[PDB]
């Protein structure tokens, strides 16, 4: 049930979905019609939640929290009145939040997907997707030793590439946060907590990779990122649910997460999370706050 309709600016409010030549349908951007159905534990869903918060779409698209499915399919945009699933194509969801929903953004919202960077961004995001975002899952769910070995090697070639890329750039695409960072963060923020041990990805902890760790902290401490990250629900989901990997269903007490709140040192690379004049997200809506905050959240 892969559904790749799109919600777009050039279909007008109130319209039925409009058939496209490619067999899909295009639905209209409008307030109060659609719900984002997400899960705290799921990294793919996490992208959509972060983007919704950063752009100030919280008051125009509602939020439902459920359980993960990729590890109805989540994340999804759902038409509230009919419960039809409009789309579960998570890459187009965040691109469309940025480009199609512009007139509903908070005034002063960041430009997370700027025209001049889109071309160079495409291969960077593809490499991150196959070798890192999916790379952890291929390592963790490997069905043989040989499959583990290869997946692990691929993951670490890519993490070493990222560590080097981020030695001279504050964020993946330079001075400011972009869509690329929103696609990388959900993997990195779950790494020491889950993927390191549960998925056997641990050559090193992210805490031992200086550029990635500085970058991870810098993002975590930015609105939209840490305040949508529930470490308890992340760890409970993986360690309890994946009984074929962890039959005892015990959740480790560790790692110590207190480092996420420490000074990151990334200001030495210049830049800033957002361009000058960008406004910050308003207070997180009642009911959408992290239910299991760490003492530093």
Is there a catalytic annotation at residue 137?
yes
| Contact assessment for residue 236 and residue 184, using Cβ atoms and an 8 Å cutoff | no
Rule CB under 8 A: say whether 252 interacts with a second copy: yes
The stretch among 7-15, 39-47, 93-101, 250-258 that binds a second copy (CB under 8 A) is 250-258
| Distance in angstroms (rounded) separating the CA atoms of residues 281 and 92 | 22
Task: Tell me how far CA of residue 69 lies from CA of 10, 41, 74, 238, 254, in angstroms.
Answer: 31, 10, 6, 12, 25
The single residue of 42, 171, 185, 238 carrying the catalytic annotation is 42
Six-digit token string for 39: 């899960």
| Distance in angstroms (rounded) separating the CA atoms of residues 232 and 48 | 20
Show the site string, 136-155: x = touches a second copy by CB under 8 A, - = not.
Answer: ------xxxx--xx--xx--
| Contact assessment for residue 201 and residue 208, using Cβ atoms and an 8 Å cutoff | no
| Distance in angstroms (rounded) separating the CA atoms of residues 57 and 104 | 7
Rule CB under 8 A: say whether 244 interacts with a second copy: yes
- When the beta carbons of 208 and 267 are compared against a second copy, the nearer one is 208
Task: Tell me how far CA of residue 259 lies from CA of 107, 207, 297, in angstroms.
Answer: 33, 8, 12
- When the beta carbons of 77 and 151 are compared against a second copy, the nearer one is 151
Question: Exposure of 1 by Cβ count < 10 A (0-12 exposed, 13-18 middle, 19+ buried)?
Answer: exposed
Is there a catalytic annotation at residue 42?
yes
For the chain, state the CA radius of gyration.
19
**Among 160, 250, 147, residue whose Cα is nearest residue 198:** 250
CB of 241 to a second copy, least distance (A): 14
Q: Is the peptide bond before 75 cis (omega within 30 degrees of 0)?
A: yes
The single residue of 2, 34, 90, 137 carrying the catalytic annotation is 137
- When the beta carbons of 82 and 248 are compared against a second copy, the nearer one is 248
Show the site string, 197-226: x = touches a second copy by CB under 8 A, - = not.
Answer: x--xxxxxx-xx------------------
Show the site string, 100-139: x = touches a second copy by CB under 8 A, - = not.
Answer: ----------------------------------------
- When the beta carbons of 246 and 272 are compared against a second copy, the nearer one is 246
Contacts to a second copy from residues 256-295, by CB under 8 A:
256
- When the beta carbons of 31 and 245 are compared against a second copy, the nearer one is 245
- State whether residue 86 is helix, strand or coil: strand
CB of 233 to a second copy, least distance (A): 15
Rule CB under 8 A: say whether 81 interacts with a second copy: no
Query: Dmax of the chain from CA atoms?
Result: 54
- State whether residue 111 is helix, strand or coil: coil
The stretch among 41-49, 107-115, 247-255, 260-268 that binds a second copy (CB under 8 A) is 247-255
* Binding-site ranges for a second copy (CB under 8 A): 142-145, 148-149, 152-153, 196-197, 200-205, 207-208, 244-245, 247-248, 250-256
Q: Which residues are catalytic?
A: 42, 137
């Amino acid at each position: 049930n892969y559904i790749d309709d799109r919600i777009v600016a050039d279909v007008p409010a109130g319209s039925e979905p409009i058939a496209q030549e490619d067999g899909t349908f295009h639905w209209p951007v409008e307030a109060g019609r659609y719900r984002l159905v997400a899960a705290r534990a799921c990294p793919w869903a996490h992208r959509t939640v972060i983007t919704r918060r950063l752009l100030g779409l919280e008051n125009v698209i509602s939020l439902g929290l459920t359980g993960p499915t990729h590890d109805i399919t989540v994340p999804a945009l759902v038409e509230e009145s009919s419960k039809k699933v409009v789309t579960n194509d998570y890459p187009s969801i965040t691109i469309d939040f940025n480009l199609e929903w512009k007139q509903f953004h908070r005034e002063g919202a960041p430009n997370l997907y700027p025209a001049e960077l889109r071309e160079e961004m495409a291969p960077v995001m593809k490499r991150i997707f196959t070798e890192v975002n999916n790379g952890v899952y291929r390592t963790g769910f490997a069905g043989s030793q040989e499959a583990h070995n290869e997946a692990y090697k691929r993951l670490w070639v890519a993490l070493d590439w990222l560590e080097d890329r981020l030695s001279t750039r504050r964020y993946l695409m330079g001075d400011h946060i972009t869509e690329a960072d929103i696609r990388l963060y959900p993997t990195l923020v779950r790494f020491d907590a889950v993927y390191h041990g549960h998925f056997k990805c641990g050559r090193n902890k992210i805490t031992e990779m200086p550029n990635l760790w500085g970058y991870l902290r810098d993002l975590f401490q930015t609105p939209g990122f840490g305040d949508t990250t529930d470490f308890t629900e992340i760890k409970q989901h993986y360690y309890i649910t994946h009984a074929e990997i962890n039959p005892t269903r015990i959740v480790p007490v560790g790692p110590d997460l207190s480092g996420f709140a420490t000074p990151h040192g990334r200001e030495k690379l210049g830049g800033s999370p957002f361009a000058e004049g960008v406004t910050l997200p308003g207070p997180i809506p009642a009911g959408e706050e992290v239910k299991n905050p760490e003492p530093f959240q």
